[PDB]
Amino acid sequence: EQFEGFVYKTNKNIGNKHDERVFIIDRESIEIPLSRDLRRKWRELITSYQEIHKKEVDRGDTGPSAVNGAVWSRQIIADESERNLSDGTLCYAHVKKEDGQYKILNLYPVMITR
RNA sequence: ACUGAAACUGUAGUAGAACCAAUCGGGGUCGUCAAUA
Structure with missing residues (x-):
């Protein structure tokens, strides 16, 4: 198939990770109102990711000590710009029917999330 | 069409009486962290 869209490249966050994912915008799509509830949740969640390892990041660890062969996930080393859910930011949405x-329910920066 | 003279603003009087630098706090202890394949 031929598709188009965006690449949700995070980094080599896990030792078994092989692939990034790319969002096949070429096809079916659904638009949902962005509430302020999801905005505060994102900021609080992304603050958590960025604050928790601040000591490890600042002392120059290239990735989490507990996972070998791996580097910080994008949202952790990203700036506070990532913490604000701005126009065109990519996400995973936790959804139900x-x-x-x-x-x-939530917006999440990774498949298996904090 | 003759300058008055002479005279300590001084004497007595405790910036003091009362008032707590003090109230609470085991040098303690478990599971998280990362996200895909």
């Missing part, structure tokens, strides 16, 4: 509608 209810009342016949796609409810969105």
Whole structure:
């Protein structure tokens, strides 16, 4: 198939990780209102990612001590610009179907998330 | 069409009486962290 879209390149965050993912915008798409609730949740979650390892990042560790062959995930080393959910920022959305509608629970920077 | 003279603003009087630098706090202890394939 031929597709187009964007690449959600994070980094080699895990030792078994081989691939980045790219968002096949060429096809089906669904738009959902961005509430202020999801905005604060993102900022709080991304603050958590960036603050938790601040000591490890500042002392110059290239990746988390507990996972070998791996480097900081994009959201951790990214700036506070990442912490603000600005126009065209890429995400994973945690979603379910209810009342016949796609409810969105959270926005997450990675597949298996904090 | 003759300058008055002479005279300590001084004497007595404790910036002091009362007031707590003090109240609370085991030098203690477990699972997280990373995200894909």
